Amino acid sequence: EARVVINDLLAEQYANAFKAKEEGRPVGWSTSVFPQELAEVFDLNVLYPENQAAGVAAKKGSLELCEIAESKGYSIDLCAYARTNFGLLENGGCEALDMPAPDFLLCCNNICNQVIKWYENISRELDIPLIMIDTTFNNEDEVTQSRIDYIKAQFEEAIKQLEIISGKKFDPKKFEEVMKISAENGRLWKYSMSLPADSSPSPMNGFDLFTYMAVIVCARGKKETTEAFKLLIEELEDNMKTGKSSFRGEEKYRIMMEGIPCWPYIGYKMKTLAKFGVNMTGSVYPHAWALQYEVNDLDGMAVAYSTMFNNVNLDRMTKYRVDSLVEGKCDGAFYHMNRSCKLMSLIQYEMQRRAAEETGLPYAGFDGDQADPRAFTNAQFETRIQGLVEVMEERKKLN
Amino acid sequence: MEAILSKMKEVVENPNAAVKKYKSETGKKAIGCFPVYCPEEIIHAAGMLPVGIWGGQTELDLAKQYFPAFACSIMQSCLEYGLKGAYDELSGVIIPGMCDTLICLGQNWKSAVPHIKYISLVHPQNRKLEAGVKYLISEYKGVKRELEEICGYEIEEAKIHESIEVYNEHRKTMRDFVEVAYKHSNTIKPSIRSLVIKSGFFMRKEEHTELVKDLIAKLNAMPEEVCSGKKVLLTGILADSKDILDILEDNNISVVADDLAQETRQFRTDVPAGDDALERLARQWSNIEGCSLAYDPKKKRGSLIVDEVKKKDIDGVIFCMMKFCDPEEYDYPLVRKDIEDSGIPTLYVEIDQQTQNNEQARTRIQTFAEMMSLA
Ligand SMILES: CC(C)C[C@@H](O)C(=O)O
Ligand code: SF4
Ligand code: SF4
Ligand SMILES: [S]
Secondary structure (H helix, E strand, O other), rough: OOHHHHHHHHHHHHHHHHHHOOOOOEEEEEEEOOOOOOHOOOOOEEEOHHHHHHHHHHOOOOOOOOEEEEEEHOOOOOOOOHHHHHHHHOOOOOEEEEEEOOOOOEEOOOOOOOOHHHHHHHHHHOOOOOEEEEEEEEEEEEEHHHHHHHHHHHHHHHHHHHHHHHEEEOHHHHHHHHHHHHHHHHHHHHOOOOHHHOOOOOOOOOOHHHHHHHHHHHHHHHHHEEEEEEEEHHHHHHHHHHOOOOOOOOEEEEEEEEOOOHHHHHHHHHHHHHOOOOEEEEHHHHHHHOOOOOOOOOHHHHHHHHHOOOOHHHHHHHHHHHHHHHHOOOOOOEEEOOOOHHHHHHOOOHHHHHHHHHHOOOEEEEOOOOHHHHHHHHHHHHHHHHHHHHHHHHHHHOO | OOHHHHHHHHHHHHHHHHHHHHHOOOOOOOOEOOOHHHHHHHHHHOOEEEEOOOOOOOOHHHHHHHOOOOOOOHHHHHHHHHHHOOOOOOOOEEOOOOOOHHHHHHHHHHOOOOOOOEEEEEOOOOOEEEEEEEHHHHHHHHHOOOOHHHHHOOHHHHHHHHHHHHHHHHHHHHHHHHHHHHHHOOOOOOOOHHHHHHHOOOHHHHHHHHHHHHHHHHHHHHOOOOOOEEEEEEOOOOOOOHHHHHHHOOEEEEEEEEOOOOHHHHHHOOOOOOHHHHHHHHHHHHHHOOOOOOOOOOOOHHHHHHHHHHHHHOOEEEEEEEEOOHHHHHHHHHHHHHHOOOOOOOOEEEEEEOOHHHHHHHHHHHHHHHHHHHH
C-alpha cells in the first residue's frame, strides 16, 4: 500500500514538471540538501539530478550516458552522477526516465564541493541563473558566528533572484506555513527510519530506506508527504506486532552498512545478503534530512543546513557511526568504498579504525560505485560478506 | 647571470637547509603554506618565513594507511612527506579548504601529525558579495590569532600594510621578467624559466626581488632574440619536473607564458588600496580571475588565455593535467573548446609525481612540435 503510494507520488512530480514546461512555467534543477523552503514559497517546480541518475542506473541505462560524456572529454575520475547528467543533456534526454531541461539552478555544497564545478558548467553552457548557498566546512565543534551571518545574507540574495525568475513577491505569511510543514516531515522521516533499531527482528528490509529517501529529498515542504509518511508508519508498527517484514530469509545477523547502494546491482545484493541471513538495522541516514529548527528562526535554519553530517569534523563524523552501531544492537559493520565519492572515501580508513576500537565489533569492506557498473564485481562482494559472516558466527558460538 | 642562477638552484634542491639557516640567523620561525592561495603577508609581517609546499617526486608507503589510490598525485606526495617527518622544522601549516581533497587532508593531519599545528582557512565562493568580503575578514582574524599563539607576540596593523607594499612590488617585478623572457626566448630555456619563478617560495620576497631585477638588467643588455623553434603556453596545476622540461627542450620548444597555479596565477593580480589591512587582502580574492578554484559561472578562463596567445604570437597551448584532479577535469572540455574555436591547437599531457615511465609523453610531444612546424 504505502509502497505504491510513495511510488505514485514520485512519478507525479515528474509529470507535473513536464506540464509546467510545455506551458510557460520555469523549471529548476537542485542539489539533494538545498534549502528547498526558499523555492516552495513561490510554488516553483523543482527536480533533482541525483534522483534521476540513481533511477536510470537501477534500470541499467546509466552506462550509455556516462560514455557520451566521456566521449565529450569528461574524465572517468569524476562523480558518476555528474557524468550521467552530462550525457543526459547532450543526448537531449533519455527513455528509461526522462525529464525536461531547466530554466534555473539551485546549488548548496553541504554534501560536497564537486557540485560547485558541475553546476558552473551547466550554467555557462545553457546560459541560465545559478543560485549559490555556500556552507563552508566546520573545523571547530560549533558553527562560527561568521558562518551564521554569511548564510543568512545568502538567503537574502537567493530570494531576490527568485522574485525575478518567478515574477512574484516574497510572502512572509506563506514562508511561515512552509516552515511548519517542513518541520513535521523532518521528524516523521527520522522516527520512521529509526524503527528497525529497537525491534528484533526489524519490520523491514534495510535496503527499503533508499526507496523512501527519494520522497524526503524532492518534496520535503509538501502536505502530501506528511500524509504518506503517516501511512507508512501505521504499516511498520503493525509489522512490529505480527512478526511480519519485507525481509526474506531468517534475520540471524544485524549490521550497519556505510555508504549508498550500488544501483546497477541492487537486486543481486538484496538476495545475497538474505541468503546469509544478514539485515541492516543500524543507519546514519535518518539524521540526514531531519533538519530541525524552531519555526520562524532564521539563525536556527542556517545552523541546520550547515551541520548536515557531510559538513562536520572527523570527530563528529565518527560519533555518528559509533552511536548507530550500539543503538541498532549490531553485530558488525560492512563498508562500501565508493569510487565516485572522494569526500567519503578519503576519511574511511581512519573512521573505521576508530569505530572498531570503541565498540569492539568486527568489520570488512568492498569496492563499488552508486551508478557506474564498471566498478563492481559480484565475486569480490560474495567473498567479503562470507568472511564477515564466519566471524560473527564464531562469536555467538561462544555466547 | 651564472652567480644568480647558482644561488637559486641551491635553495630549490635543498629547502630544509635553507629553513634552518633562516632560523639560526634571525631567531624567528617558519610557517608552511599549502597549494594555490594563502595570505603570506600576515606571516611576513610577524618577521616569519612563509614556505611554499608543492609535493615532490616520491613513492608512496605510509600514506596508504589514510588515502585510497584515487586521491590526486600532489596531495599523496604531501602526506607521505609529512608522515615521514620532512616538514618537522616548521612551526605550523596553513591548509586551505579549497576542494574535497584538501579538506580531507587537513582532517587526517590532526591525528596523524600531532606535532605540527594545523591552521584552518576556507575561502568563500560568493566572493563578490559584500557579505562574502566580511566573512573572509573574520577568517583572516582567526589565522592572525593562531599565528600569535605560535610566535608569542602581537602582529601590528602598521606592519601588515608594510608587507603588502613589499608583495605588490614583487608581483610587478615578476611581471617584468615575464616580458623580458619572452624577448630572449633562445637564451631562457624552460628549465631556467621555472627555476627563476619557483625560487620565490624559499626566501623572503624582498631578497627575491633584488635578484630578479639584477637578472632583468643583465638580459636587457643583450640583443632581443628571434625564436628558433616553437612557442607555447602551459596551463594547469604545475610543471616543474626535470623530466618534462628536458623533453620540451629536446624538441626546441620555448615557454613564453603560463596559466599554472604554481607560477603566474600567484602574481597576476595585485592587492588594492585601503585603510583597513585585512580588508585589503580580502578584496584581493574578490578580484582574482581565470582560475579553476575561483568561483565563476561565466568561465572567463578560456578568453583570458586566447587574448594572451594573440599578444605574443604563440604557436600552441599544452594542458598539464594533474592526475586525479577533479576541478581541473571539470574545466577541461569547455576551456579547450574556446581555445580551438579561435584557431589555436592544443595537446593533453598527464602529470604524475609517482610516474615510473614516460615514453607516452615523449612520442606525443614530438608529434605536436612537428605539426606546429608545418603550420
Ligand atoms: C550524503 C548523501 C545525502 C549523499 C547522497 O544523496 C548522494 O549524493 O547520493
Ligand atoms: S556521490 Fe559524493 S561526490 Fe557525488 S554528488 Fe554525492 S556527495 Fe557529491
Ligand atoms: S584535487 Fe586538484 S585542486 Fe584539489 S588538492 Fe588536488 S590538485 Fe589541488
Ligand atoms: S593544488
